[PDB]
Amino acid sequence: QRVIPVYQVNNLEEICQLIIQAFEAGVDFQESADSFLLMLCLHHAYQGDYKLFLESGAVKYLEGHGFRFEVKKRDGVKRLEELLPAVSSGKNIKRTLAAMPEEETTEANAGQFLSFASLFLPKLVVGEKACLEKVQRQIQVHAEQGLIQYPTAWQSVGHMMVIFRLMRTNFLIKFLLIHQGMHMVAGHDANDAVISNSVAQARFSGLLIVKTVLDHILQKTERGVRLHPLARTAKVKNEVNSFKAALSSLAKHGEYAPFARLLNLSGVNNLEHGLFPQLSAIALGVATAHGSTLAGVNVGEQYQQLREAATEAEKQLQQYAESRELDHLGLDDQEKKILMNFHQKKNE
C-alpha cells in the first residue's frame, strides 16, 4: 500500500517548469514522479490550493482506493535535485539532472504537458505505434483546428515514447487526467478542452468489442429492450452467468467503468470476447443475419456451427415478427393471409 509524499512550496511555477524540463530531458523518475505530477496537476487544475485539492473528489477516491498522501512543507527551494532525497537510483537520476543544460528553456506550462499527455490516452492501451500515430494525427488535427500549438521539441519520437512509457507505467497521472476530463470539466481554457476531448475519446478504450457483442446479445422490442432469447438457451447458461457477474463486477466501478481497461481496474480482466466464445459466436451470428458484420471477433471452428445456426435462428425470428406485426394493423383475414404469403414469397 504505497504512500505518496506531496510537497508544499511558495513558487510552484518554477518547480513545474523545472519538472517539464526534466521530462523534456527524459529523466526516469520512479517514486517522485507521482509527487511531481501531483504538483503539475495541482498548479494547473487546482490552482495550487492544497486544501481544495485534498478536499476534491479525486483525492478522496484515490485515498479510498489505497494510494494515500502526506504533506511536506519545503518553502526554500530553487533547484529540483534537493526535493528527491530517497536513495534508490537517486545519484543516477541526479547525474541525469546535473547533466541538463540550465541555459535553454521551452515555453510550455503544466496544462500543455498535461494536455499533451492526455493526447496519448485513447489508443494508449492498444499499441505503442498505434498510440503514437494517433497522438501525431490528433496533434495535426488540433493544429489544423488551431486549438493549440505544441512545442516541435515534443513531437520528437523518443519524447513521445518516453511520455508513452510514463503514461503506461504510471496510474495517478491517468486517473487525474481522466478525472479532470470527465468530472470537473469547468473553465474556459484550451488545454482543459483538449484534455476533456481526449478523455471523451478514450471512453471504452479496449472494450469496444465486448461492448458491441453485448449490443448484439441485447434485443430491441415493442416492450423495451430485452436479453436475446438465443442467449437464454440452456447450453450457454453458465457463460451467460459468468458474463453477467463479470459485467456487474465492471459496472460496480461507476462513471469510471469506460476507463476500466486503461486504469486496469479490478474486474476488467474478466471481460474479453475470447472468454465468451458461445456468446461472441451468437452475437456474430445475429449480426451476420441482420447483414452487418462484427469487428474483432474471430470465431472458433467448433463454434462456426453455432454461429451458422444462430444466423438462421435470428433470420427466422425476424421473419416470424412480420406476421405478428401484420396482426396489429387493421385488415381482413384473407388480406393478412395474402400478405404473409407475400412474405413467404419474398423470403423464398
Partner: peptide
C-alpha cells in the same frame, strides 16, 4: 420490428452501472 440495439446506449448504461445488469439479465 425487433433487432439488436446498435446504438450502444444500453450497453453503455449497463457497463456504467446506470442500469443494473439484473434488470436485463433475468433467469426467472
Amino acid at each position: 420490428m425487433p433487432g439488436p440495439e446498435l446504438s450502444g446506449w444500453i450497453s453503455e448504461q449497463l457497463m456504467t452501472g446506470r442500469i443494473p445488469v439484473s434488470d436485463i439479465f433475468c433467469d426467472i
